[PDB]
Amino acid sequence: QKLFVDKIREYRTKRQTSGGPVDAGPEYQQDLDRELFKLKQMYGKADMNTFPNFTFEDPKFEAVEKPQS
Amino acid sequence: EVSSILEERILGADTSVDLEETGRVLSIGDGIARVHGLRNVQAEEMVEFSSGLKGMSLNLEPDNVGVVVFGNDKLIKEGDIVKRTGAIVDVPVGEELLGRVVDALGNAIDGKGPIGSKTRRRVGLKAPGIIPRISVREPMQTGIKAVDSLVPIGRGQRELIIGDRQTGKTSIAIDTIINQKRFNDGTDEKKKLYCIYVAIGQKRSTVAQLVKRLTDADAMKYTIVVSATASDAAPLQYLAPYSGCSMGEYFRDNGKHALIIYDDLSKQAVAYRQMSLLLRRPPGREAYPGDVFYLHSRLLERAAKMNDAFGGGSLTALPVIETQAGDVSAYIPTNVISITDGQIFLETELFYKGIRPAINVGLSVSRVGSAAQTRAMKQVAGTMKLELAQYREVAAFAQFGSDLDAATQQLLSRGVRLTELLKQGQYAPMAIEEQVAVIYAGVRGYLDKLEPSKITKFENAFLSHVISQHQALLGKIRADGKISEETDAKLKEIVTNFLAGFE
Amino acid sequence: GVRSGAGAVRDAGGAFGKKEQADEERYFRARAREQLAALKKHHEN
Amino acid sequence: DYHISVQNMMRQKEQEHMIRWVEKHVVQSISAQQEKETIAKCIADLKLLAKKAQAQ
Amino acid sequence: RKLALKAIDWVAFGEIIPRNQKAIANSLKSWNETLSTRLAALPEKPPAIDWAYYKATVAKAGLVDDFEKKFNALKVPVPEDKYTALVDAEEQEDVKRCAEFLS
Ligand SMILES: Nc1ncnc2c1ncn2[C@@H]1O[C@H](COP(=O)(O)OP(=O)(O)OP(=O)(O)O)[C@@H](O)[C@H]1O
Ligand SMILES: [Mg+2]
């Protein structure tokens, strides 16, 4: 369990990292940006803080001349 | 949160150690590892290698135990240690698999988290005997007019979907899966059908397309997609039908009704042939081993309709066989045809003749027969089947039908109109009442005057009209299950009015 | 059971397939000649 | 659902980055830890004795 | 959104026989069928919004609570039916003419 305790210590040290998910990873920023761009492209254009408002109209059937008794 | 939950997971996991039974790899090649030692290994028992790959001990030879590898063979070296799990291969089972795509071993591959399965079931359990089963009576509505009319399928029946490549077998299976939506989301429990689609030897892109198609139709919420793609090792493709069969057996034993679709059982047979040949097992016709009929027989026999004493559940099997140039006399097609009850035959000629789906009603048969139909569908389908047989008898003279007998011309016209009725679009299953209404409008001679090319337009318009305005009659037909005389008169009035107003 | 299909006469490439091909070609050569004559007469207008 | 999916994706990326760092650091650290290797030589000897007592 | 009551499209619907207007009557019948299909397609009102579960699943601060507040304050309007009243008046005039002809 002592090896497991050492693993727990390493996990705790990673937890206390002030930079959080930095890990000294130069490609972490690039990978995160690529993932975000892919997610945005898949979901399409959107706004982080906005509401959906729209209006529409429907024209009924136009009158057609028809004479009869 | 992520770090905290990760540490919670790792503290939850316990690194226990214990004794085992182990052996060394004498020779590894082509996914077959010859293992020295491992004296107390059961036949067909899961064993795991040092590299983490799992395996199945098939050949228990005296000097060595031949084990198939569940992965790439590059990770297994000579001298590696093969531990013994101590149990025959088993897969997670339960309602938790619904909506999930899993591999041959039940591991989730859709990236939606672990399966919350609480029960574990083997893959080689014997099929129920003669006594527990009961005669198939409940219909299994596929949503296709041709199938539900001329080749009906009951719950507990092994119906084959046989035909050449690019003919619509996968489309038939997928629309059968889609059609069951109207029963599952409803309230009647004894009508819900849980579909299980097993993909064997198919590229991951095709499986992804199928999963997207199901998700867009809201059919994944009651469907399990067991995937053993072409990239996966041959043992996984061999096991996938059995894993899906066990997943369906869980529903069958608990009184629920499950539908299992073994897509491309021919590819599973090819994988088993590869395993047998690499194990130096003696070959036979077309290099298949002697126990290749056994492979499919002990799999399809697990599809059965249990009696009320055992729960009343069911498991309907829809194997798919990819014939070559329509040769049904080949080894695997003959085996599967002999094992199953009937088959739904698709032909390329009919597919490109405008008859889509390409179901060849002359060759397609159903040994369970009309016993797997509702009373109204049976009533219309007997007449339609007789008339279509009469038409197919006289279909040779259609080229020179102008200078023929009046009876022959009448038969030709009726058969052409019925064939136009049998045509149906893709991913558009029809309710049983809609199908029975269309077939009634056809067989009762309400289309003879109508142009043969205008049947499809008339069919769509009539379906829209009856769904919109005459929903009460369709509901009464569905609830009663039979076209009674009063409903017959009402249908006569409705079809007469719509035919009069069609022009 | 062994069965057959549509358009299997020309697939065999026997006497009947060649006969059918020759008959079709000879008929449609005359039809093309007639259509060319009609088109030329129309184009003269 | 746009925000929900973005947050879920970011959570997954953070999780995989954290586990990558952990798995690339623990092995080298313990390889450089002789003072923990000597006690890891005896984390299981008592466990081995307990296991053999279970066997016997 | 309760559906407006209407009479059955019986043979009297085809009894109009308008001068070069049978196509118009067929188009009206098609419109009625399409309206019935659209009504059957979706329920009377859209599904409710699980604001509590959304906020529980919303890590963002401000962009989520204000979005829910706007959605609650959101009030989509409804279309007008002046053309319906005009067509009703025209039908009333036609009915008066029919009554005079019947007399
Ligand atoms: N009823 C139908 N009407 C029109 N097109 C159809 C119909 N059923 C299937 N198709 C089309 O036929 C093609 C083949 O369908 P499908 O993939 O189901 O056939 P298959 O024989 O099972 O395939 P494969 O042998 O490649 O596994 C597809 O393009 C599909 O869209
Ligand atoms: Mg297919």
Side-chain angles (χ1 to χ4, degrees), chain B residues 146 163 220 333 356 368 496:
Chain B
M220 277 297 299
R356 288 177 299 275
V368 311
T496 312

Side-chain angles (χ1 to χ4, degrees), chain B residues 21-25 33 35 38 47-50 67 76 80-84:
Chain B
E21 185 74 9
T22 53
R24 304 174 294 100
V25 179
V35 174
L38 278 182
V47 297
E48 54 181 357
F49 291 81
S50 178
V67 53
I76 309 304
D80 296 2
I81 296 305
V82 185
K83 298 178 298 301
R84 190 177 84 100

Side-chain angles (χ1 to χ4, degrees), chain B residues 16 30 45 49 53 58 85 133 186 207 227 319 364 370 374 388 403 409 416 433 448:
Chain B
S16 178
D30 302 322
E45 174 195 49
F49 291 81
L53 294 172
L58 291 183
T85 306
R133 304 190 182 194
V207 182
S227 180
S364 299
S370 56
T374 63
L388 264 182
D403 37 355
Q409 296 174 350
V416 166
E433 53 272 6
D448 300 336

Side-chain angles (χ1 to χ4, degrees), chain B residues 164-172 264 322 351 356-357 424-426:
Chain B
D164 301 15
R165 37 89 177 182
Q166 309 294 336
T167 52
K169 308 167 297 182
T170 304
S171 71
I172 285 183
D264 297 330
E322 181 179 350
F351 180 83
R356 288 177 299 275
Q424 181 171 344
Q426 197 181 6

